[PDB]
Amino acid sequence: VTGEPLIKEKAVTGIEAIGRGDDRNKLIDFITTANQALGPQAMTQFLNVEEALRRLAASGSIDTTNLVKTKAQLQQEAAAQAEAEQQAQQQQLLETGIKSPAMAQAVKNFQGADPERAAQALSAITSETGGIDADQLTEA
């Protein structure tokens, strides 16, 4: 609109220079007084807990990261953790926790008594159910 630079300047002299730290202390003391008044239940909806790992490390120079678990790395590790817990959940016990080897004995009966009759009876069992390719059964 005007052409003036988007950033301007300011001069600090005397008590202002001495008490810029006092201004910081005023902000922090307001935050701390709010935390005292409200407690752990403060942490919801007015005054930010101001989250000190990333940006103030980049404030006053210096960069981010290093100790900072980056949002990308944090998401990757969360996904890995979720996959590990799902691996825990998949076949959760089962192979031994299941009641009794009735399926093992039934497999014994399939293989023993006329394997072709076992195949046609397994086809009947997969007819009780469906919607699954039998070509996926031969990839286990």
Added chain:
Amino acid sequence: VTGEPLIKEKAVTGIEAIGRGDDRNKLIDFITTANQALGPQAMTQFLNVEEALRRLAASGSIDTTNLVKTKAQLQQEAAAQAEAEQQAQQQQLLETGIKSPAMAQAVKNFQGADPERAAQALSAITSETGGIDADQLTEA
């Protein structure tokens, strides 16, 4: 009604400027004295616990969010947690939880004893119950 601007201007001089912080201190002291008089049972129906993460963060400039698990984000994560605990409730054990492999033996018998008579038997099972599409059985 009048045409006057909806916001006016004030002037603060001297002890008023020195003790606006005292005004804040008096408000917080009232809150703290009420909390002392009533305790954690106070937290119910007169004086707000004032919830410090979101808005007083936006007070004195600065935006919301950042740490704030937004109401949308909180609802999304609560829904995900609810679905996860439902999945925990969904199929609670069962594969290992059932008492004895009687229906496993039943599956073997349907496999073994006249699979067509077994299919008529499963139709009779769906007759002792009902109102379920048999076409949903073939999507497992």
